[PDB]
Design a protein around this ligand. Structure first.
Ligand SMILES: [Zn+2]
Ligand SMILES: [Zn+2]
Ligand SMILES: [Zn+2]
Ligand SMILES: [Zn+2]
Ligand SMILES: [Zn+2]
Lengths: 634, 216, 81
């Protein structure tokens, strides 16, 4: 009414320019507002709106056109006081919000709208411009009094108009987005575009890299003390577009020049920076692949001619290159799938075709060299290998194996060498052999390693059966010699039929007894004895100093042919032993090279002169060797 | 040892490619496979694609009516069904290559390495080659009067057919995920067996040709 | 004179068969058969002196009762072990 309006105006003027009044004042004001609304307060609504507009105009009468560092100290303080006072006023006239705005504008929203109109006056551009000028101390200077910026930002966010838009929902940040975020984002883009190039024009790019990482960290930090939370992602995207994503050319050039050096600490930095953006790793993977390929190829180029006859050096060089670059990939580039794939492709390329394969005029020289390395590593040498070291080295051979592609040539070579190594009783560790076969099978399937498994179990079964022969021999008077035999399969071992031998009479008893024994335990089986690889012992109870010889069966036949006389020729020996011509020539040459057999001549070069069928061979009765148990073999 | 030469514009021939412009010259014709270096190969004598076990004349007589009272129709239906099945599968091998490759990237991105998709590629190649041989071995089998040496052949190629079906079944579904150490072993053990079997079939056919063992 | 003390010979195990293909699965006679391979496989014989795997001749007789190199009846003559 009228008798109430003057006192209520006095009270409202009291609540603004706050003086911390007591409960009696606010209670009597509320009583007035309740008294009017009972007797439907549209005219009171009009009076309140007009009073608010007039007070805002009075306030704007001062503080306008200051333009710097003071419109902030003005605006934030005015805003805090006005917001608090308006909240209290919404407290006082709270009967309007309950029974006249339910049949239509709540007083707090009206005060916000009027202050919004106080934003749509020259205050809007001056305040935002001063805030941006304050943040433009990004360079240095802790002059950003964060309470002079958070207040403005909170004012903008709160001023998102809601006058019956739909209803009070939550953070309505339309005004923030359309009046402050856009200018801030544009100015950030401009500032970074200028300073990034200004720095990049004077210094090596490593320092720029450090600075860019620091700036990204800083701008992530800033949104946690000044601005609103829903700007982190967008500001991050803008900074990622300006600092990086617009210098990929210089990044690629520096990446190559870094790889040519050995700096493994800032390569991680470049991986981080480039991976922050979408698909920027495209050129990095290809460039790394090319570099590691060329490194490995030119690395084994250094060995040159010496590698082609030494498996150790070749496999060692390949393993060294692979080890270094795998170590780099697993620390800097974080085991990224693409970089691991690049390493794998380059390793395949430079293992398969390189200087050694080119010099050997084929690409099946690397699997042969690997197989020969594994051979030389599993033979029984002077040193007695330690199990852990041997197992580790086999593990490394498996890597270099998994990088080759014609894994059949390797199988042929390994089968041949394992055959020799098993037949001649000359192997380091059955455990090592079994483990190697097992991991070949695990890495290439069951069909790959069937022949090797059979070749192994066959020597096992032969060792078994020889003991049973010994047991059965206790009832049949073993004539004069130790008989140890190794019965192999026929489809597995890479051995030919035979070499047309005639058995001497000194062995026929054991031969027939064992063949009859074998025929007993099995249904139908044909032992095709092969004498081209079988050794034994001779005692020579004919000479002066009781020597002992250790040679193949061919030497046994030829020597025992002299039990009658000592005047046989090439033809005379041929008749009684039925051996092939060139094989007999080779064996007689080996015998004459040894001091056992001499020709008619006393000091001839028998080692080189060819022998003719009508040439007598004389048993040298004066044979003598310094040591005992002479080993005559090649 | 078959010396042939490829050049541009009874011992020269034109290339059946849709638009290749080359000439193939050879020393002496034996219905052997020649490659035009334009991406296509064909046997020099007749003019269709390379057919290893079956002779050219029977291929002609089969392709004339490529598509007789009651049982001949059943035999023809069975054989042409198998032949067209293999041809329809082979014509879509581009889709098979793309499918296995996209599988390679999909399976590699889910925390798995490169060598695995490598053996997958090898298996696919062997599968396609085996199908291409079964194609013409059926043609050879059709024009054949039943005797002792025909039952054996018809019994071996059925097993090879089954193995191929097994291989192709493995790929699609059982390359699913995170079971490499067994699925790989099964695939390898299967495609080595398939390759060995197809080599056996081709050897049997050619030995039969040499020994005059078949009857038509 | 005597000059013999020890001997270590090496001999090959092989089936007693004139020809080696098994003529059913065309494998090598010593290898595994077409059944035992895609995963005891011994060699059986006959009166006409022909040789086949056991698991090949078994199915062959399960279908037809003729030795498949000679149009004659077939009965076992010697198992293989
Ligand atoms: Zn062409
Ligand atoms: Zn043709
Ligand atoms: Zn079997
Ligand atoms: Zn068989
Ligand atoms: Zn028979």
């Amino acid at each position: 009414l009228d008798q109430i309006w003057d006192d209520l105006r006095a009270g409202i003027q009291q609540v603004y320019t706050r003086q911390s009044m007591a409960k009696s004042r606010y209670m009597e004001l509320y009583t007035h507002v309740y008294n009017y609304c009972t007797s439907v307060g549209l005219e009171l609504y009009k009076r309140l709106k007009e009073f608010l507009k007039n007070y805002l105009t009075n306030l704007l009468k001062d503080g306008e056109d200051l333009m710097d560092e003071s419109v902030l100290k003005f605006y934030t303080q005015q805003w805090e006081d006005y917001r608090f006072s308006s909240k209290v006023l919404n407290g006082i006239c709270a009967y309007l919000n309950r029974h006249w705005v339910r049949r239509e504008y709540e007083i707090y929203s009206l005060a916000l709208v009027t202050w919004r109109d106080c934003l749509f006056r020259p205050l809007n551009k001056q305040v935002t411009n001063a805030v941006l000028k304050l943040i433009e101390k990004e360079r240095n200077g802790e002059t950003i009094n964060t309470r002079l910026i958070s207040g403005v930002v909170q004012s903008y966010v709160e001023l998102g108009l809601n006058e019956d838009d739909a209803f009070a929902k939550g953070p309505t940040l339309t005004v923030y987005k359309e009046s402050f975020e856009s200018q801030f984002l544009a100015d950030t883009e401009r500032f970074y575009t200028r300073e990034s190039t200004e720095f990049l024009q004077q210094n090596p790019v490593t320092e720029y890299m450090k600075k860019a990482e620091a700036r990204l960290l800083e701008e992530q930090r800033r949104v946690q003390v000044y601005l609103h939370e829903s700007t982190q992602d967008e500001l991050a995207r803008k900074c990622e577009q300006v600092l990086i994503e617009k210098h990929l050319e210089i990044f690629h050039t520096e990446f190559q020049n870094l790889l040519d050096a050995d700096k493994n600490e800032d390569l991680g930095r470049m991986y981080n920076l480039v991976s922050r953006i979408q698909d920027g790793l495209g050129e990095l993977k290809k460039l790394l692949e090319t570099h590691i390929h060329n490194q490995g190829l030119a690395a084994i180029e250094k060995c040159g001619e010496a590698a082609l006859n030494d498996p150790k050096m070749y496999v060692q060089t390949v393993l060294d290159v692979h080890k270094k670059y795998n170590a780099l990939v697993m620390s800097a580039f974080n085991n990224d799938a693409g970089f691991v794939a690049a390493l794998d492709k380059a390793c395949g390329r430079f293992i398969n075709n390189n200087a050694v394969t080119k010099m050997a005029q084929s690409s099946s020289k690397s699997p042969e060299l690997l197989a020969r390395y594994c051979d030389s590593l599993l033979k029984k040498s002077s040193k007695n290998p330690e199990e852990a070291e041997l197992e580790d080295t086999l593990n490394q051979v498996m890597v270099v194996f998994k990088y080759i592609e014609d894994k059949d040539v390797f199988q042929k070579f390994y089968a041949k060498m394992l055959a020799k190594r098993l037949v001649h009783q000359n192997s380091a560790s059955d455990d090592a052999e079994a483990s190697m076969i097992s991991k070949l099978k695990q890495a290439c399937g069951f069909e790959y390693t069937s022949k090797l498994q059979r070749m192994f179990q066959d020597i096992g079964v032969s060792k078994d059966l020889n003991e049973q022969f010994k047991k059965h021999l206790t009832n049949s008077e073993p004539l004069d010699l130790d008989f140890s035999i190794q019965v192999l399969s026929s489809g597995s071992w890479p051995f030919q039929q035979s070499c047309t031998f005639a058995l001497p009479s000194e062995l026929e008893r054991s031969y027939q007894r064992f063949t009859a024994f074998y025929a007993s335990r099995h249904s139908g089986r044909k032992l095709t004895w092969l004498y081209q690889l079988s050794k034994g012992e001779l005692v020579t109870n004919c000479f002066k100093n009781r020597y002992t010889l250790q040679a193949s069966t061919f030497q046994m036949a030829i020597l025992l042919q002299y039990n009658t006389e000592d005047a046989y020729t090439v033809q005379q020996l041929t008749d009684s032993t039925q051996i092939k011509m060139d094989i007999l020539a080779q064996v007689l040459q080996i015998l004459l090279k040894s001091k056992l057999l001499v020709l008619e001549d006393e000091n001839a070069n028998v080692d080189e002169v060819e022998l003719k069928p009508d040439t007598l061979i004389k048993l040298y009765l004066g044979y003598k060797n310094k040591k005992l148990r002479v080993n005559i073999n090649v | 040892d078959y010396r042939y030469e490829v050049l541009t514009a009874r011992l020269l021939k034109w290339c059946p490619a849709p638009d290749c412009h080359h000439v193939v010259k050879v020393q002496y014709p034996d219905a052997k496979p020649v490659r035009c270096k334009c991406g296509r190969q064909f046997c020099f004598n007749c003019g269709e694609n390379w057919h290893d076990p079956v002779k050219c004349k029977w291929l002609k007589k089969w392709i004339k009516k490529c598509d007789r009272s009651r049982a001949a129709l059943q035999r023809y239906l069975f054989y042409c069904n198998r032949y067209m099945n293999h041809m329809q599968s082979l014509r879509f091998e581009h889709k098979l290559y793309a499918q296995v490759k996209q599988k390679m990237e999909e399976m590699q991105q889910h925390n798995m390495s490169w060598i695995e998709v490598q053996f997958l590629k090898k298996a696919v190649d062997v599968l396609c080659q085996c199908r291409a041989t079964l194609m013409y071995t059926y043609v050879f089998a059709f024009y054949l009067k039943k005797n002792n040496q025909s039952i054996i052949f018809e019994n071996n190629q059925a097993d090879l057919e089954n193995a191929t079906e097994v291989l192709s079944g493995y790929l699609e579904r059982d390359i699913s995920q995170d079971s490499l150490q067994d699925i790989k072993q099964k695939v390898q053990d299967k495609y080595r067996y398939c390759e060995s079997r197809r080599r056996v079939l081709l050897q049997h056919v050619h030995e039969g040709y040499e020994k005059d063992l078949w009857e038509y | 004179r005597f000059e013999v003390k020890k001997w270590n010979a090496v001999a090959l195990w092989a089936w007693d068969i004139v020809v080696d293909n098994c003529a059913i699965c065309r494998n090598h006679i010593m290898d595994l058969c077409i059944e035992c391979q895609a995963n005891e496989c011994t060699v059986a014989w006959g009166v006409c002196n022909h040789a086949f795997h056991f698991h090949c001749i078994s199915r062959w007789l399960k279908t037809r009762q003729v030795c498949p190199l000679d149009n004659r009846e077939w009965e076992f003559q010697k198992y293989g072990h």
